[PDB]
Structures are given as C-alpha cells and as structure tokens.
Write a protein that binds this ligand. Sequence first.
Ligand SMILES: O=C(N[C@@H](Cc1ccccc1)P(=O)(O)C[C@@H](Cc1cc(-c2ccccc2)no1)C(=O)N[C@@H](Cc1ccc(O)cc1)C(=O)O)OCc1ccccc1
Ligand SMILES: *[C@@H]1O[C@H](CO[C@@H]2O[C@@H](C)[C@@H](O)[C@@H](O)[C@@H]2O)[C@@H](O[C@@H]2O[C@H](CO)[C@@H](O[C@@H]3O[C@H](CO)[C@@H](O)[C@H](O)[C@@H]3O)[C@H](O)[C@H]2NC(C)=O)[C@H](O)[C@H]1NC(C)=O
Ligand SMILES: *[C@@H]1O[C@H](CO)[C@@H](O[C@@H]2O[C@H](CO)[C@@H](O)[C@H](O)[C@H]2NC(C)=O)[C@H](O)[C@H]1NC(C)=O
Ligand SMILES: *[C@@H]1O[C@H](CO[C@@H]2O[C@@H](C)[C@@H](O)[C@@H](O)[C@@H]2O)[C@@H](O)[C@H](O)[C@H]1NC(C)=O
Ligand SMILES: [Cl-]
Ligand SMILES: [Zn+2]
Length: 608
Amino acid sequence: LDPGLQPGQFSADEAGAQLFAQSYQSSAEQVLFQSVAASWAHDTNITAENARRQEEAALLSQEFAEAWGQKAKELYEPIWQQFTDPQLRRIIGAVRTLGSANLPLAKRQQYNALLSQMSRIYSTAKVCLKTATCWSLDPDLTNILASSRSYAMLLFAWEGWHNAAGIPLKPLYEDFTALSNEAYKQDGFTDTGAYWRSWYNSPTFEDDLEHLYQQLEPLYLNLHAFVRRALHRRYGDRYINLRGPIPAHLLGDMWAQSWENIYDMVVPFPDKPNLDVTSTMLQQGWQATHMFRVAEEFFTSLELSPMPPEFWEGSMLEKPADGREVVCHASAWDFYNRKDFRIKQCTRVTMDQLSTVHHEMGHIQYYLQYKDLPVSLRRGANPGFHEAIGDVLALSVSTPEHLHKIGLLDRVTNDTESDINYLLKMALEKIAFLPFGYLVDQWRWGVFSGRTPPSRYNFDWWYLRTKYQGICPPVTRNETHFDAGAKFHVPNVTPYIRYFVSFVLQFQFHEALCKEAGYEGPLHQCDIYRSTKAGAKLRKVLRAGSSRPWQEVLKDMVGLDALDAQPLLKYFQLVTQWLQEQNQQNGEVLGWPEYQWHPPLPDNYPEG
Ligand SMILES: O=C(N[C@@H](Cc1ccccc1)P(=O)(O)C[C@@H](Cc1cc(-c2ccccc2)no1)C(=O)N[C@@H](Cc1ccc(O)cc1)C(=O)O)OCc1ccccc1
Ligand SMILES: *[C@@H]1O[C@H](CO[C@@H]2O[C@@H](C)[C@@H](O)[C@@H](O)[C@@H]2O)[C@@H](O[C@@H]2O[C@H](CO)[C@@H](O[C@@H]3O[C@H](CO)[C@@H](O)[C@H](O)[C@@H]3O)[C@H](O)[C@H]2NC(C)=O)[C@H](O)[C@H]1NC(C)=O
Ligand SMILES: *[C@@H]1O[C@H](CO)[C@@H](O[C@@H]2O[C@H](CO)[C@@H](O)[C@H](O)[C@H]2NC(C)=O)[C@H](O)[C@H]1NC(C)=O
Ligand SMILES: *[C@@H]1O[C@H](CO[C@@H]2O[C@@H](C)[C@@H](O)[C@@H](O)[C@@H]2O)[C@@H](O)[C@H](O)[C@H]1NC(C)=O
Ligand SMILES: [Cl-]
Ligand SMILES: [Zn+2]
C-alpha cells in the first residue's frame, strides 16, 4: 500500500476518532476510484488481462481496508460503541469491519479469483443449438422468453440457460460462501447473511418483512390464479394444471420474476387502447439514445440534475457490435471522483427497457445529488431507497396520460375498463415480482447460515420457488443443477432483499410525491412530471445520502418511520377487488394444492 494511502496517528478517544474518520475518507476516495475503474474496464470488455487487473485492484482495496481497519480496532474497539456522535459510531463501526480483508493473503486472492470467475461464467455463458450457432442471455434468450409462445422453444431456452449458467457455478459458489463466512465471522457476525441484513439497522427486520409479505400474498395469489387460467386457455390441459404450480418458463421472463411480457394473453379488455407501447416504440424507431434522453428530461422536469457530459461520453448504452464480451446486466456506476458517473446497459427497444433506463438513471441521480458529501455518506438511506428512486418516476411515466404526452399512445379514456387494464398490467410487473424479491435472499441467508448446505442448494431453491411463486421447473432438476446460480445477483454476490424493500417503498414515495405535487385523483393516475415541488421533496432524500437513519428520512418524506404496504394496496385496490371477483366467478382455486405436479416433456423433446 502506497505510503500516502496509509493511516497516520490519532488519539485513542472520541475527538481523535473524529480526525481519524476525516482522514480515512480523504484516502478512501482514491482507492474507491481505482477499484471502480478496473471493474469498468473488465465489465465493458471481458478479457483475461482485464480480470487480472481487476483482481489486482481488489487486492489493493483489501490492503487499504486492512490498514485502516486494524487502526480503528487498535485505537477504538473497546470504546467506539459508547461514542456520543451517532454518525461517527456508524463510520468507525464500518471501518472496524474488515470483511474479506480479514482473510490472509492467499485466501484474499482465492476470494477475488472466485468473484472474477463466477462473474465471467454468468456473463459469457451461451446456449448452443447451425450446430456452431449459440444464443446469449441478452438479447437472444431474453427475446425468446419474452415473445415466443412455443412451449418447446421456451423450454429449450429455459433449460439451456439454467444448465449453461448454473452447473459450472456450483463448485465455485460453495468455495465463495465458505470464504465469505470466514471473513465476516472475524468481524463478529454469525455469517455473511447477518452482515447483509445489518445494513437495515432494524433489530426486527426479518419479522417486519414477513408481516409485509402476509398483507401482499392475497394479491399475488389472485393474480397467479387469473394468469394460470389465461395460460391454460393457450397451452391446454396438458401443460397447465389449474390446481398446480405454473411451469416456470411460461411467464415472459427467464426467472418468472416479471410477467409484463404475457400482457397480451391476460389483458381483461382487449378492445381498449393497447397499454404496452413496445410496438409503437419500434414503429416510431426509438433507439437507446432516445430512451435515455426521454428519461433524463423527466428528471430535469422535476428540477433534478441532467446527466453530465462525462456520463454521455463514458456510458455504454448498447451491446457493443464489435467482437467484445461485456456484462450485459444493467448497472449504474459511481467512480468516487465526483465527476464520472456511468450506466452500462445493453439497451433493447421495449417498454420494460424504458422503465429499466429510469431505474438505472435513478441510481445516477442519487450519485449526482450526494457527490459532495464525505465518501462514507455516499450511499442510499438504505439500499432499498437507492433501488426505489427510478421506479418511482417510471410509475408516472407508464400512466396512459403520460405516454400520450410523450407521443406513445393516442388519448385514452378515463373509464373503468381502461383502469383495470392498466392496473392489471402494473400488477404483472409489480405484484408478480414480490414473491421473487422476497425469496432470493431467504435462499441465500439459509446458505450463508449453513441451514442450506451444497447438498440442498437446488432442493431448497425450488422449495422456495414453489412456496412463494407457485411455479415448478419444466424439466426434472437434481443437485448437479444450481438454478439459483442462473440468476445474475447470485454469482455476482450482490444482495436481493433491497428489491423487495424497493417495491414497497416506491409506492410509499409515489403517494408522498403525488400529494406534494398537489395531485387530487386516484393514486394510479398520478403523474408527477414537471412538479418542481415533488422534485424538491425527492431532492432532500437524495442529498441526505446515508447521513441520517433511514427511518427518519422516511418519516420526513412520507410521514411514517416504517415500511408500509398500505400505499401499494391503495394503488392496486380496484384490480385487487376485480381479480378476486373474477376468480370466484370462474371457480378458481387460489394457490397450488397439487404441489408435486410437473408438466410432461413435449413429444419430440429436445429437438424441433
Ligand atoms: O447498479 C446497481 N445495481 C444493478 C445490479 C447490479 C448490482 C451489483 C453489481 C452489478 C449490477 P441494478 O439494480 O441497477 C440492475 C437492475 C436491472 C433491471 C431493472 C429492471 C427494471 C424493470 C422494470 C422497471 C424498473 C427496473 N429490470 O432489470 C436489477 O438488477 N434489477 C433486479 C430487480 C428488479 C428491480 C427493479 C424492478 O423494477 C424490477 C426488478 C433484477 O433485474 O432482478 O447498483 C447501484 C446501487 C444500488 C444500491 C446502492 C448503491 C448503488
Ligand atoms: C379519470 O376519472 C376519474 C373519476 O372521476 C369522477 O367520476 C367520474 C365518473 C366523473 O363523474 C368525474 O366527474 C368524477 O370526478 C377522476 O378522478 C377524480 O379526480 C378529481 C379531480 O382531481 C377528484 O376531485 C377532487 O376530489 C378531492 C376529494 O378527495 C377534492 O379535495 C378536490 O377538491 C377535487 O374535487 C376526484 O376525487 C377523483 N375521483 C375519485 C373517485 O378518485 C380522474 O381524475 C380521471 N383521471 C384523469 C387522468 O383524467
Ligand atoms: C479490451 O481490453 C484489452 C486489454 O485486455 C485492450 O487491449 C489493449 O489495447 C491497447 C491499446 O488499444 C494496447 O496497447 C494493448 O497492447 C492491448 N492489450 C492487449 C493484451 O491486447 C483493448 O483495447 C480493449 N478493447 C476495447 C474496445 O476497449
Ligand atoms: C442430474 O440430471 C442430469 C441431466 O438431466 C437428465 O437428463 C435429461 C435429458 C432428463 O432425462 C432429466 O430427467 C435428467 O435429470 C444427469 O445427467 C445426472 O446424472 C443427474 N445427476 C445426478 C447426481 O444424478
Ligand atoms: Cl440489500
Ligand atoms: Zn438498481
């Protein structure tokens, strides 16, 4: 570690702790920068030489983390918990927590190599059929899951991906879990999952989540039964069991996590205007550039910041056309130099991708708003806040009235049929996700705690997938398969519960900004576009970073200091009642009592 980057001396008391924290943050900025740059270089251009450089940057970050961490523990371990200043308790508390820097050198290198190899496997995995031709997840497999209605073709894509990504990840993921736990246990956590959960500073986190899910589950059950009936009408009594789980490949998405793509099959009133504007975007010839500019302009309408020149010059907004492998999974980047901020997204011209652009731009806007704070306060109030920002705007954007304003929809009527179509569409996107958003880290917490050893990785994954989502694998799986590994966030070792928290929080935010905007109608028809008052209220959250506990930031914004499902329920209320009525009238069974049921294979599986 460079002498400039090493800690000096400070007194062993709170006042010395303050100078320590100030000096730590000054040096951390340069270390953060080299790490992010090295990651960018790799993720936008996956090569062996780029991975090596990224691993060297990771090692440097660990050197830094060890030097300052050991210093924190040397001076403040017996006393920091009694420090009068809570903001200081949080920083010294962080710095004493070394993570992977607790590992000896050989194991650090092992750890960094594992993260690189898992990332490469997920992002370069292919499904091969000409016999030489192979499909990538993004865009090829994504498009198949989205627009193919051929049971056998969907199965080929689903099975191919899960096998390609999952099988070779398993041995690496076991090794990562052991090293991760080894590292965090030295910091005093029972396991890595306990550390991840501690970011929410709620002694009652898991219980709070379970109570939230209990209120939401009836909405999911009804949507599920309605959707399963729509699928049965298309795929027949052979492939769909009206009392069983839905086969996992028929919902529009590789993970059955958003059901927006099957909207045309489920839309209650097909003779109203088509609220999926994808085909209009194609007909009008929208490109990635347009999508990003349209998203930016919503942000500036609120008097939030435009994207800076560095963003437009540095960002990767389409999958490269040259012979280059990249991580296509979308992300938003802060380089920690208060100047460079970028999105990396393999943008496709679709309505859901337009919402995705807003999502990533929400992350950037957060970065732009808190860029002048001490480096340790450059985070969301909690990670769920960071995930909610862009989704909040996308809720206004997808309203039929807003789509009309941006030329994507001829004026729609204020009628009850159109409302049900819209709310059903929004349910496929938002309600359908909830079980998945909840289950992923239940699975991962069980793995980190040891309740789920490698011998039960897949058994427990599918237990959870069936329990919450009411889906089943369309082919037989066993413990050689590692289906959790075929989801980005697992091999990329980044937490998922933030998204469940985001989905509740975004409706709380939406309700608060709509009220602030002076809007008076139904919550699902609110468009905060051009509301500088809504913008000012959002800006206060963004500029706070993590300087204040999230419960207080939420209280100031929303009037409540806790996550609350009521705003989401309020938003969906009309379609919640409608689906319940329809399911009853149709004589549906809610849930999937035939829990053991799996679909048969197509007659000519796997060729076609
Ligand atoms: O860039 C990220 N995180 C990206 C993931 C990531 C994490 C670590 C390392 C590399 C990458 P993402 O969540 O933007 C990447 C986004 C991509 C995305 C968004 C949408 C979308 C669809 C419709 C409407 C709105 C959004 N569909 O895919 C993501 O994964 N989302 C989750 C879950 C999800 C989130 C929102 C949502 O609306 C739907 C789903 C997923 O795809 O599984 O982190 C920024 C940040 C977060 C928290 C604190 C600080 C910084
Ligand atoms: C789409 O249509 C709805 C429904 O509008 C209502 O019912 C129709 C059948 C007609 O009779 C309409 O004339 C009638 O308003 C609209 O919802 C309504 O919006 C209005 C205007 O913002 C709301 O009026 C306000 O009500 C609050 C009370 O909460 C007062 O404080 C205000 O002074 C103001 O009068 C009205 O409450 C609201 N109705 C309901 C049931 O929520 C909706 O605005 C419209 N949407 C669009 C985008 O055009
Ligand atoms: C992808 O990364 C590689 C490095 O892995 C880059 O290749 C280097 O490019 C510079 C200048 O173009 C050369 O001086 C080096 O000799 C190259 N290194 C190697 C190992 O070949 C490459 O430029 C990157 N590609 C893109 C499009 O950015
Ligand atoms: C697990 O399954 C592997 C491959 O899947 C199998 O082959 C396909 C075509 C179907 O027939 C499916 O039912 C089978 O599961 C097997 O090759 C492998 O032997 C199995 N692993 C273990 C440990 O038994
Ligand atoms: Cl999280
Ligand atoms: Zn995100």
